[PDB]
Amino acid sequence: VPQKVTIAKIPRAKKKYVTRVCGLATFEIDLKEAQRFFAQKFSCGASVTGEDEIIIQGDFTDDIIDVIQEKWPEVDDDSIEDLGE
Ligand SMILES: [Hg+2]
Ligand SMILES: [Hg+2]
Numbered sequence: 001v002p003q004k005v006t007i008a009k010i011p012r013a014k015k016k017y018v019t020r021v022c023g024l025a026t027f028e029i030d031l032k033e034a035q036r037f038f039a040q041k042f043s044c045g046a047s048v049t050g051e052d053e054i055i056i057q058g059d060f061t062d063d064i065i066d067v068i069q070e071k072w073p074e075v076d077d078d079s080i081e082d083l084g085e
Pocket of ligand 1: 021053
């Protein structure tokens with residue numbers, strides 16, 4: 001009986017997403033330090049991508065609300081909204 005090892009990758013149906021945060025600068029949060037905070041808390045790249053918006057290179061839509069409010073308590077529950085897709 002032969003003696004061999006094979007490795008391969010097989011796509012899943014689950015998509016890779018990107019997480020977009022808009023409105024931080026309206027609470028007079030600085031988008032640059034917001035970007036770097038997100039980068040480090042999530043261990044994942046991020047960039048300011050609009051004039052008030054930051055894009056994080058993963059799906060963090062579960063935590064992202066609580067994380068935002070922990071770090072910036074100004075942001076009350078009636079002013080941060082999870083859109084969807
Ligand atoms: Hg936006
Ligand atoms: Hg990542």
